[PDB]
Amino acid sequence: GSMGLQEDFEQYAEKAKTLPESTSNENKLILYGLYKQATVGDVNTARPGIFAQRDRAKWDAWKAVEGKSKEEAMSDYITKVKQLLEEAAAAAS
Ligand SMILES: [Cl-]
Ligand SMILES: [Cl-]
Ligand SMILES: [Cl-]
């Protein structure tokens, strides 16, 4: 990752903590998948079964961004968090 992007990523991963607890799980899943992809790369497990204890929705969100470089997924994660942060501020004003 380039330096400025890595700094941005760590900053926005920290700012993501300020999103309301009530943030839709649809968006939590999008952030989860990009965060996994950005930090550890391609999902390296098989899809959890429907009745498994492993969370299929989380795995699916990560599978969906397979193939993105660290730079790309950090990029997307940042843009999604930025959008959510602006929407949270709009909701509160
Ligand atoms: Cl920025
Ligand atoms: Cl929801
Ligand atoms: Cl992992």
Swiss-Prot record:
<comment type="similarity">
    <text>Belongs to the ACBP family.</text>
</comment>
<feature type="binding site">
    <location>
        <position position="17"/>
    </location>
    <ligand>
        <name>an acyl-CoA</name>
    </ligand>
</feature>
<keyword id="KW-0963">Cytoplasm</keyword>
<dbReference type="Pfam" id="PF00887">
    <property type="entry name" value="ACBP"/>
</dbReference>
<dbReference type="GO" id="GO:0006631">
    <property type="term" value="P:fatty acid metabolic process"/>
</dbReference>
<dbReference type="InterPro" id="IPR014352">
    <property type="entry name" value="FERM/acyl-CoA-bd_prot_sf"/>
</dbReference>
<dbReference type="InterPro" id="IPR000582">
    <property type="entry name" value="Acyl-CoA-binding_protein"/>
</dbReference>
<feature type="binding site">
    <location>
        <position position="58"/>
    </location>
    <ligand>
        <name>an acyl-CoA</name>
    </ligand>
</feature>
<dbReference type="GO" id="GO:0000062">
    <property type="term" value="F:fatty-acyl-CoA binding"/>
</dbReference>
<keyword id="KW-0446">Lipid-binding</keyword>
<comment type="function">
    <text>Binds medium- and long-chain acyl-CoA esters with high affinity. Can interact in vitro with palmitoyl-CoA, oleoyl-CoA, linoleoyl-CoA and linolenoyl-CoA. Binds phosphatidic acid (PA) and phosphatidylcholine (PC) in vitro. May play a role in the biosynthesis of phospholipids.</text>
</comment>
<feature type="binding site">
    <location>
        <begin position="32"/>
        <end position="36"/>
    </location>
    <ligand>
        <name>an acyl-CoA</name>
    </ligand>
</feature>
<protein>
    <recommendedName>
        <fullName>Acyl-CoA-binding domain-containing protein 1</fullName>
    </recommendedName>
</protein>
<dbReference type="InterPro" id="IPR035984">
    <property type="entry name" value="Acyl-CoA-binding_sf"/>
</dbReference>
<feature type="domain" description="ACB">
    <location>
        <begin position="5"/>
        <end position="90"/>
    </location>
</feature>
<dbReference type="InterPro" id="IPR022408">
    <property type="entry name" value="Acyl-CoA-binding_prot_CS"/>
</dbReference>
<dbReference type="GO" id="GO:0005829">
    <property type="term" value="C:cytosol"/>
</dbReference>
<feature type="binding site">
    <location>
        <position position="77"/>
    </location>
    <ligand>
        <name>an acyl-CoA</name>
    </ligand>
</feature>
